[PDB]
Nucleic acid binder design. Structure first.
Lengths: 62, 142, 122
RNA sequence: GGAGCUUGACUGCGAGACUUACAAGUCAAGCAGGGACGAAAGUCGGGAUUAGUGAUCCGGCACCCCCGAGUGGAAGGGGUG
RNA sequence: CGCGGCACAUCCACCUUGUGGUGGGUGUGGGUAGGGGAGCGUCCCUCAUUCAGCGAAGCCACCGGGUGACCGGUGGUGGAGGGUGGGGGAGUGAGAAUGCAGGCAUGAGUAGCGACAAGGCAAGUGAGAACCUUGCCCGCCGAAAGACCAAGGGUUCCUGG
RNA sequence: AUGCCGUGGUGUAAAGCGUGGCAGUGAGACGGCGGGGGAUAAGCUCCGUACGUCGAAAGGGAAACAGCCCAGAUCGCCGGC
RNA sequence: UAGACGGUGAGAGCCCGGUACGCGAAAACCCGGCACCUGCCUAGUAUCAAUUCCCGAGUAGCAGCGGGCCCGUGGAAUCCGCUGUGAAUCCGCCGGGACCACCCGGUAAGCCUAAAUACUCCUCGAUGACCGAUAGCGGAUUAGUACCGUGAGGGAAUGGUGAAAAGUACCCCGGGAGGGGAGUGAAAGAGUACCUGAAACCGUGUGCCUACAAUCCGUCAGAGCCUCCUUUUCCUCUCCGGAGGAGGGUGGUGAUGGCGUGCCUUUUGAAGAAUGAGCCUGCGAGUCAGGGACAUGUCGCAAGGUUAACCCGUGUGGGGUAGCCGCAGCGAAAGCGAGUCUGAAUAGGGCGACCCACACGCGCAUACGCGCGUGUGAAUAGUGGCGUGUUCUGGACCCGAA
RNA sequence: AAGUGUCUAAGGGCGCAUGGUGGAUGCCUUGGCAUCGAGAGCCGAUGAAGGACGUGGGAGGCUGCGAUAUGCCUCGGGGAGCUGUCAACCGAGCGUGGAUCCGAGGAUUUCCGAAUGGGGAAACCCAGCACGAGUGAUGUCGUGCUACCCGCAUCUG
């Protein structure tokens, strides 16, 4: 009757200035002590979602 | 008349009634198995049992400022191409000419040199805006 | 608009059961059985169109062979002669002139004899 | 294997590719800050390499005019670690 | 391979040098799940036109036709509604669900005909008599197979057909 | 040896890659070669193979015959190889 | 002002009932109209320091446990319950999402209050791209009936002669039913078993074949036998047509030969000794709702598109500018802006802004073409409706438990 | 002598012709479902809704009605038939002096049912008092009230 946006996946996904959905590359939350800085500037940012996770994510964003 | 009325060839597409004989779309109508999909429909969330891409990724950082002062912008270069003469404009004149919606607080942006002699009234000018509009002869306002 | 799907169905029903007359059993009688048999009849007739091409060829071959061996030549050598002589007849008309004209067929056999090389070497 | 002196067992990054169903993983020249060692060249963003670890949600402990539900605060939240 | 007839895809020469069509050359045309495209038939609403008590639908039969769904013609039946053209709309198509209702088959004129108490003989009535009535035999029950009540039934009672 | 990656040339029709809509599939079988587990076994079980076929492929051969060999059916022909 | 609709022996504006329109009433109920009856005020309203009292009590608050709110006790205010404790009366309390100070809004612990709102047992009026006897109400037909169950409860089936009954007088076979003839009727090929009359199913007759022979019950090749149809040797009676027939054509049937392992579902694999189906006729499964999400085909208009509820009208027609989306992005956000975020830095980077075969004039060039707007006329976009596919929330393809 | 040569139909199959069964298809309809519009929006101790039992000249059912029982009275309307219907049969009647029929108002309105005098297997059993009939006299009959609870008025305590 009026479509629900999946909440949990709109609080984790972000439609950018154009048709890109940017997830958060963040196995970067719990244990950051053994992890070299390299593997954190590897896990610090917002990654455009790949193809094989898009058709569903957008239907989670709607 | 009405006996001479047809759509454009390209619309009015044939409906697909599926379970109508094994010559068009026959028995299984497209769900061609005995699986789960053959009687019902698995959601977009469910992924097999492993945490879906909306549970294993982290919620996006930061909050949402409840008091986000959202504006509406009007383009200084496109305020040139809105008013070729100009001379006198102001937010009401923008919504009048149809440059931005009503019920608004306005910013004026700064793409393109505004080469019209114009004075603009609108809240919250940007750097390049005030620069260009005060170099086009006219000035900025509040 | 509730449609009353009788007429639409009775069309193909009468189709099947008029193209199914002359069937021993519950096959000219009943409809589903007439349909099972229509599928089998038309695959049979399909297979028999090809099959009959090949089978008439084998029959003509038996006949040409009989008239050949009436002329002391085997069918193999008869064909090899009618080839080397080149008379582009085919087993059908060859068998027809075999039946009606023993004379024309024996002329053909002498043609074939005169067009065999020497031997079983070549 | 030993002997010296030290902390790069760095802060902000990262072209690029390896691999990858996705998530995750791995390398990374070189750029700047501010250091070590060296006369310098250079090398150092842990150990000869590959195991020694767990996603998410949720709480915690600090730094930051990020927000602060009338306004000043604040609790609470937020980023960073 | 030959010879004919369809179809699809790319390509050019073309017509209006992209729409859509003429000619050709080449390739292609098994198919399941499944994907695309094009279509038949049922019924309802509109516009156009048209057939109909001289005979509408439905049905049946024959003769044809289309590459398929299917279509037309003709006669028989019937006795009031259908053609077709452009469109709108479907409870739109069945051979299966141990599907649902009705009808009707096979088993099959087959099993059975409900206790191991036992029947007949004469006469009658009657269209018709093993079973009905009259008699006379004969037999079975007689702590019940007799006679009563209570519930239970609810007219099964009696006369007449 | 093969296979794999690249480049260079010739050949080849949709084959490729990117991005969408719509699916299905995720019980495979045998057969050839290469191997594991079996026992030097199985119509066994599990793998590899730009190997095949059935799956989902009819016709001919195999007596009969899903998987073997020939061959991939657009329809017709009482024509040929 | 009547061509609505329905009936009359067919398809009726003019035959009938009616319609259009107009009349229409005692009494009732009710709309409402005037007079009577009742309900007030015989100034303290103003301005006044403010001398004082009052402004809804076991209530508000606070703590405990719960409910409820988007708010799952979380940090939660506001509100509501139950238990303790428990206030003030305006210089009081209450709220403004803990709380505090200032600033605002209002005065809870009395009660009452039309409208727009939903609703349908009921009567009137109407309509339908609603069904038309297996449908549509379970119920057209004695219907919640008959029957089922102790009971609560469950719960059917069953419509059509004809225009008019003119419903077959009369004889005939029969004990009747039933028929035959007669007659009614346009039709009995409408007989109270009745409109039309399907199929399965059950017979009667007739052409073929079949009692030495296996064969998913057919197909192909095929002799013959019967068929109607016919060209002719033919009879020249052709001034009228067909006989035993020859050529020929469809149609029964088919002696005989070869080929051939039903349909479905499901399976690596089925003719399968796997499932399901005795047969015929009717019914049975992918629908629709939403200014839904996605993609696309087509169509409006154009940096726009579009209205929602609602208001006017009677054909779905005209108003309705709230809102939604498009118009600028970045960032946690403050913010900033064709930039924005990180950072010490733009150095990078992440996200987003921008496109010619040449100009105008120049920076420079080895033939180079990167640069700017004005153009040579630089280049396009959405939004709304309609079909389509998929998806969402709805039983959402139908059927089926324990 | 040797060889050939069908004829048969107990009965089957096939196709036609002729029937029967059954009740599909078509076309309806005295029926529903769905909405729109205007109403109305409660009934009941003054006895409801829903019924049992009866009521017609004759059987029942439906319908109407209630021991006054397909009806009673007045007001109106209308005007020629009528005696509701399945279901159309026999009766025997009325009506132009206004019948059937239609609207509004009244009377009658058994018994059960909240059921309420008490009881009860609802539709039945059995009473009290007071009027009013009936018998020689009780028995019998006709009418009315008699439940409970709360509230109020009154004596009460």
């Amino acid at each position: 009757p009026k479509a629900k946006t999946h909440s949990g996946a709109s609080k984790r996904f972000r439609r950018t200035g154009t048709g890109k959905i940017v997830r958060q590359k963040a196995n970067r939350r719990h244990l950051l002590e053994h992890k070299p800085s390299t593997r954190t500037r590897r896990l610090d940012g917002r990654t455009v979602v790949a193809a094989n996770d898009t058709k569903r994510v957008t239907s989670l964003l709607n | 008349k009405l006996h001479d009325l047809r759509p454009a060839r390209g619309s009015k597409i044939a409906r697909t009634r599926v379970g109508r004989g094994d010559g068009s779309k026959g028995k299984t109508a497209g769900r061609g198995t005995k699986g789960t999909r053959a009687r019902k429909q698995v959601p977009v969330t469910f992924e097999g049992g492993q945490m879906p891409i909306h549970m294993r990724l982290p919620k996006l950082k930061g909050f949402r400022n409840r008091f986000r002062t959202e504006y509406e912008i009007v383009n200084v270069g496109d305020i040139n191409r809105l008013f070729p003469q100009g001379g006198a404009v102001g937010v009401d004149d923008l919504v009048a000419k149809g440059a931005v919606r009503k019920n608004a607080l306005v910013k004026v942006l700064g793409d393109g040199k505004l080469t019209a002699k114009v004075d603009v009234s609108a809240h919250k000018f940007s750097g390049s805006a005030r620069a260009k509009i005060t170099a086009a002869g006219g000035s900025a306002t509040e | 608009a509730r449609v009353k799907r009788a007429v639409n169905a009775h069309k193909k029903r009468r189709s099947i059961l008029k193209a199914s007359r002359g069937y021993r059993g519950q096959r000219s009688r009943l409809y589903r059985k007439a349909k099972e048999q229509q599928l089998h009849s038309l695959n049979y007739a399909y297979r028999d169109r090809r099959a009959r091409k090949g089978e008439f060829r084998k029959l003509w071959i038996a006949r040409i062979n009989a008239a050949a061996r009436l002329n002391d030549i085997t069918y193999n050598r008869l064909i090899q002669g009618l080839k080397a002589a080149g008379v582009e007849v085919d087993r059908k008309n060859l068998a027809d002139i075999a039946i009606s004209d023993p004379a024309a067929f024996t002329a053909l056999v002498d043609v074939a004899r005169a067009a065999l090389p020497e031997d079983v070497n070549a």
